[PDB]
Amino acid sequence: TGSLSVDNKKFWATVESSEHSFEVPIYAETLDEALELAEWQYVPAGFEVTRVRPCVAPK
Amino acid sequence: PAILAEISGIVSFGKETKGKRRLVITPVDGSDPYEEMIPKWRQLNVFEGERVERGDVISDG
């Protein structure tokens, strides 16, 4: 549907719209990779990211 | 984490679409990449290109 590679690690990104505000996981392989997508994937869709929190927790 | 670097190394900043801050830390403690998007309103660990240690910077959590 747009970006989102894999879910080896769960990254959290809370996004805010004109009124609505929600949280959505980011799916990528690398940290920076997800960091890119969290902003770069959501911002062209009119969604403005508010804050993120990567949840790696070594397996 | 709180107001710290999850890994020791050189923490640097990158593009921010609006009022954010790209947190890209360059680990010296090991080959363990750690990057996130911390907003600019957040009291950051330190400035970009700065050397810090895992957890030890401003506030541990």
UniProtKB/Swiss-Prot annotation, chain A:
Function: Acts as an inhibitor of bacterial RNA polymerase by interacting with RpoC subunit and thus preventing promoter recognition by RpoE. Non-DNA-binding transcription factor that plays a role in the transcriptional switch that abolishes transcription of the viral early genes (class I) by the host RNA polymerase but allows transcription of late genes (class II and class III) by T7 RNA polymerase.
Source organism, top-level taxon: Viruses
Keyword annotations: Bacterial host gene expression shutoff by virus, Bacterial host transcription shutoff by virus, Host gene expression shutoff by virus, Host-virus interaction
Protein name as annotated: Bacterial RNA polymerase inhibitor
InterPro entries per record: RNA_pol_inhibitor, RNA_pol_inhibitor_sf
Lineage start: Viruses, Duplodnaviria, Heunggongvirae, Uroviricota, Caudoviricetes
A Pfam family: RNA_pol_inhib
GO biological-process terms attached to the record: symbiont-mediated suppression of host gene expression; symbiont-mediated suppression of host transcription
Subunit structure comment from the entry: Interacts with host RpoC; this interaction inhibits host RNA polymerase activity.
From Swiss-Prot, chain B:
Top-level taxon of the source organism: Bacteria
Post-translational modification: Acetylated on several lysine residues in the presence of glucose.
Disulphide linkage map: none
Biotechnology (record note): Co-administration of salinamide and rifampicin or salinamide and myxopyronin suppresses the emergence of resistance to both antibiotics.
Subunit structure and binding partners: The RNAP catalytic core consists of 2 alpha, 1 beta, 1 beta' and 1 omega subunit. When a sigma factor is associated with the core the holoenzyme is formed, which can initiate transcription. The rRNA transcription and antitermination complex (rrnTAC) consists of RNAP, NusA, NusB, NusE (rpsJ), NusG, SubB, ribosomal protein S4, DNA and precursor rRNA; S4 is more flexible than other subunits.
Job description of the protein: DNA-dependent RNA polymerase (RNAP) catalyzes the transcription of DNA into RNA using the four ribonucleoside triphosphates as substrates.
Family: Belongs to the RNA polymerase beta' chain family.
Protein known as: DNA-directed RNA polymerase subunit beta'
Originating organism: Escherichia coli (strain K12)
Gene that encodes it: rpoC
Residues of the full protein shown: 1153 to 1213 of 1407
